[PDB]
Ligand binder design. Structure first.
Ligand code: HEM
Ligand code: LC4
Length: 460
């Protein structure tokens, strides 16, 4: 017996119960008709959605091994069953475990890297000279580089036409992946794939970044010395040669290229966007900026670069960084899991290959944990005491076996960089803080911020 749900129409399915502009809201809406676990057929594809902290945790922490799979995402057939994110293969487990180990070994190291990078952000920011600018392609360079150094020991100038091109692709794709047409293409790929439409643009872009990353991996291989692995890409290559004789294969050149692409855009566009929501948020609530400045000055001074150990000393900063991520629910629907082996969830049988959706926004907007969850309120992570307060509901990276791999670097990237930009700059909205609308402009894959420009006016 499957989890409850709407009666599915022929072919179409339960797509009338779905608003493509905004799926998560549809989930929320269905959650209140059928409770915490429900069944949806979209296309022929049959999915199970969990809504709310109890249901989502159970899914992600209790049935780790059962909901191990990764639902398919047709935009990314280019990536499927390879790398990590889109790997629903027998390949998945080890190439993840290895990169995760490697990301660890490059991270103790990570602090310095972000710190080094910050230098350039500030430089690029002063250069705007208190004028209006679109930050999308200023602030995004920082995560990009940080990852570029881990990935290819490569550094970019904030004006390399290729660099900017890669960022544009990441933005174009995130943008596009959160719009209706791709939501539908996501679930009816065979019907739509050869019809015209922006699904074609996404594919073209996925292919462009894969090609580029591909070339870099070949460059690496052609020059690889296995004693001196220069970066991540290297560490992978040496595993690829370590077993050229092994009959059955784990690392193929493609395999690596996908793995690398995965962290490349992953490390870049998630943190860039989050940072950009942060900045916009902070311009809505100038009094929070002011409070934050006070702390930076009190605890770090107007000079010394922010460090990880200052976080324990700064609870307003901390909480802000948290609420930023909680409020904006970047991956509001989580990334799609698949049921691996025939499974019993609460009452219900969940067949094999079922797309399991453990919805994050439903966790992040608990109106018990976070009273007025719809409001941006640092207090959500503060206790009446003024110190930091941790929430078990803070899971915008998810949890369990597919927990975001770049979490540590994400977390650090946000706090440090944000810290930096505020330490040296005040934020200027070009519209009244009263007229700033924080609502995403698209909701699918991700939650996407209004385009906006701003001024940064120095503090030294
Ligand atoms: C704002 C920062 C980020 C957020 C909110 C975020 C969120 C997520 C979420 C929700 C998932 C899916 C978890 C699931 O399937 O249950 C995921 C997966 C993943 N993330 Fe992130 N992520 C972020 C940054 C990063 C960064 C910086 C990297 C690389 C440095 C990265 C690499 C990955 C990879 C490789 C996966 C695939 C998970 C798997 O092994 O199946 N992410 N992330
Ligand atoms: O060619 C390619 O493979 C790269 C082009 C795809 C760029 C799309 C960026 C989407 C934003 C990712 C946010 C979701 N996420 C991923 C990992 N953790 C969260």
């Amino acid at each position: 017996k499957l989890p409850p749900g709407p009666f599915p129409l022929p072919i179409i399915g339960n797509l009338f119960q779905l608003e493509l502009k905004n799926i998560p809201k549809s989930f929320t809406r269905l959650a209140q008709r059928f409770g915490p676990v429900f069944t949806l057929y979209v296309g022929s594809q049959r999915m199970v959605v969990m809504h709310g902290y109890k249901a989502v945790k159970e899914a992600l922490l209790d049935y780790k091994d059962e909901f191990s799979g990764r639902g398919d995402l047709p935009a990314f057939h280019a990536h499927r069953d390879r790398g990590i994110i889109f790997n629903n293969g027998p390949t998945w487990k080890d190439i993840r475990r290895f990169s995760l180990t490697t990301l660890r070994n490059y991270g103790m190291g990570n602090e310095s890297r972000i710190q080094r990078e910050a230098h350039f952000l500030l430089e690029a920011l002063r250069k705007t000279q208190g004028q209006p600018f679109d930050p999308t392609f200023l602030i995004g360079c920082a995560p990009c580089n940080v990852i570029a150094d881990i990935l290819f020991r490569k550094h970019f100038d904030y004006n390399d036409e290729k660099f900017l091109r890669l960022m544009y692709l990441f933005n174009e794709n995130f943008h596009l992946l959160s719009t209706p047409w791709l939501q539908l293409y996501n679930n009816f790929p065979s019907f739509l794939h050869y019809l015209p439409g922006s699904h074609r643009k996404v594919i073209k872009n996925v292919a462009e970044v894969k090609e580029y990353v591909s070339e870099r991996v070949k460059e690496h291989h052609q020059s690889l010395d296995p004693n001196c692995p220069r970066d991540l890409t290297d560490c992978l290559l040496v595993e690829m040669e370590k077993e050229k004789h092994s009959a059955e294969r784990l690392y193929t050149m493609d395999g690596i290229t996908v793995t690398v692409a995965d962290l490349f855009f992953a490390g870049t566009e998630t943190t860039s966007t989050t940072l950009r929501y942060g900045l916009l948020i902070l311009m809505k609530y100038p009094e929070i900026e002011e409070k934050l400045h006070e702390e930076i000055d009190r605890v770090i001074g107007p000079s010394r670069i922010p460090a990880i150990k200052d976080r324990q000393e700064m609870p307003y900063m901390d909480a802000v960084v948290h609420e930023i991520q909680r409020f904006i629910t970047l991956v509001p629907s989580n990334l799609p899991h698949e049921a691996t082996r025939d499974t019993i969830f609460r009452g219900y049988l969940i067949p094999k290959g079922t797309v399991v959706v453990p919805t994050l926004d439903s966790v992040l907007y608990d109106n018990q944990e976070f009273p007025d969850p719809e409001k941006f309120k640092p207090e959500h992570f503060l206790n009446e005491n003024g110190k930091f307060k941790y929430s078990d509901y803070f899971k915008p990276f998810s949890t369990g076996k597919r927990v975001c791999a770049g979490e540590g670097l994400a977390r650090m990237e946000l706090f440090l960089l944000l810290c930096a930009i505020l330490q040296h700059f005040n934020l200027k909205p070009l519209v009244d803080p009263k007229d700033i609308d924080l609502s995403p402009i698209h909701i699918g894959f991700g939650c996407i911020p209004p385009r906006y420009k701003l001024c940064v006016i120095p503090r030294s």
